[PDB]
């Protein structure tokens, strides 16, 4: 498919200038062998005219730029030429970057949803001058196509790149779009949509990676976090039990810099539902994270619910501990409760937040007494073996 003047009975002394002068660059850039050569050729020594030809033939013609950006091989050359254009501070630098934004902006949604063109979008978002990259964010769709971008395996990384390298003032509309209850439901029910929400939450958190923000930027960040968190906690039960969004609830509940939302999550959808949620494949991990990071006043309510919150079965006498200890998912919650109590009485976890040290001793004594009485049944399972050994190493220390 390559032109015959370059073919070998590709040659060996084929230079980049031969390809640029010939006008056949589009044929090489879509062929695997040809584009691999162009990949290496543009890394060598380029004269000013050679850069000029590359700037016109690769990122100067909209239709050719689109064809190469959506190409399996050609998209690599576009990213390389964009880098050379951004690295060449000649008199055409401004005109080239302005034209490149218009090329991308005019086909934002189609390029975003494309497997290879979305790589060109991500490269431009993080490499172009910040003033020009913000103009790309304005070209993002605001309707259902934005949802299609967030739930696409490839397009979702464009939004992730926007979140990572663009100031929040330019993509605050994405937060409000995701915060819309119907949009949050559809996005957080998708494995890739959850990755978008997770990245946005991390960016909107006042953690160590955001101390460089100004006061105005921090205030804008806190406003967007409250609007998204409000919509998140209203679907708290749906997200905590979802196969993908349960990781998001785990993060909100475990992240230290989101501690004020720990209380909101636990009381809204976890309290008075610990036994049921502990028996779910996905919600049990959230229950684990809640026990591990709950404030001591709320941890007490959680422990009392497992120990004394449920009426035992009227026929057998099974209580909540009897059910969770031998459930395929609930046993991990009990192991977590035991580990928490063992860490407290051993000095590994601070008990003092009143001093809840005596509270941890009551729960440990409850767990120790039950594990002692059920040691034979528990010794059949790996979880019971862990619990018995967990209590065993404590008595030695």
């Amino acid at each position: 498919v390559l032109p015959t003047w370059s073919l070998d009975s590709m040659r060996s002394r084929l230079s980049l200038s031969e390809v640029l002068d010939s006008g056949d660059l589009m044929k090489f850039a879509v062929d695997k062998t040809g584009c691999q050569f162009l990949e290496k050729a543009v890394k060598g020594s380029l004269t000013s005219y050679q850069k000029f030809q590359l700037f016109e033939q690769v990122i100067g013609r909209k239709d050719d730029f689109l064809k190469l950006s959506t190409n399996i091989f050609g998209n690599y050359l576009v990213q390389s030429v964009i880098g050379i254009s951004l690295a060449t501070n000649d008199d055409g630098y401004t005109k080239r970057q302005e034209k490149l934004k218009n090329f991308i902006s005019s086909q934002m949604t189609d390029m975003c949803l494309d497997k290879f063109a979305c790589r060109v979008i991500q490269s431009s978002l993080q490499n172009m001058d910040l003033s020009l990259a913000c103009k790309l964010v304005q070209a993002l769709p605001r309707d259902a196509r934005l949802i299609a971008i967030c739930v696409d395996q490839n397009a979702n990384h464009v939004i992730q790149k926007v979140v990572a390298v663009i100031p929040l003032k330019n993509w605050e509309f994405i937060v409000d779009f995701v915060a819309t209850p119907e949009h949050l439901r559809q996005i957080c029910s998708d494995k890739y949509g959850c990755r978008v929400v997770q990245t946005i939450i991390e960016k909107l958190t006042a953690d160590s990676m955001n101390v460089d923000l100004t006061s105005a930027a921090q205030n804008l960040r806190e406003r967007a976090l409250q609007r998204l968190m409000t919509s998140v906690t209203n679907r708290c039960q749906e997200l905590a039990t979802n196969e993908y969004a349960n990781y998001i609830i785990q993060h909100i509940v475990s992240n230290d810099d989101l501690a004020v939302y720990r209380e909101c999550i636990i009381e809204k959808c976890l309290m008075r539902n610990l036994l049921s949620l502990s028996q779910e494949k996905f919600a049990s991990h959230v229950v684990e994270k809640a026990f591990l990071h709950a404030p001591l006043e709320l941890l007490a309510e959680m422990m009392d619910e497992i120990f004394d919150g449920y009426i035992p079965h009227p026929d057998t006498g099974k209580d909540a501990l009897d059910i969770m200890m031998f459930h395929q998912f609930g046993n991990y919650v009990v192991q977590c409760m035991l580990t928490i109590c063992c860490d407290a009485v051993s000095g590994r976890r601070q008990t003092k937040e009143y001093d809840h040290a005596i509270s941890f001793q009551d729960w440990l004594k409850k767990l120790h007494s039950r594990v002692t009485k059920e040691r034979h049944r528990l010794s059949r399972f790996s979880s019971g073996k862990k619990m018995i050994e967990t209590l065993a190493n404590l008595r030695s220390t």
């Binding site: 008075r272 036994l275 049921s276 028996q279 004394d308 919150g309 449920y310 009426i311 035992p312 079965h313 099974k318 209580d319 909540a320 059910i323 459930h327």
Partner: peptide
């Protein structure tokens, strides 16, 4: 399968 138990009161 799930083994659910009736809750107690909070008063």
């Amino acid at each position: 399968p799930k083994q659910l138990l009736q809750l107690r009161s909070e008063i």
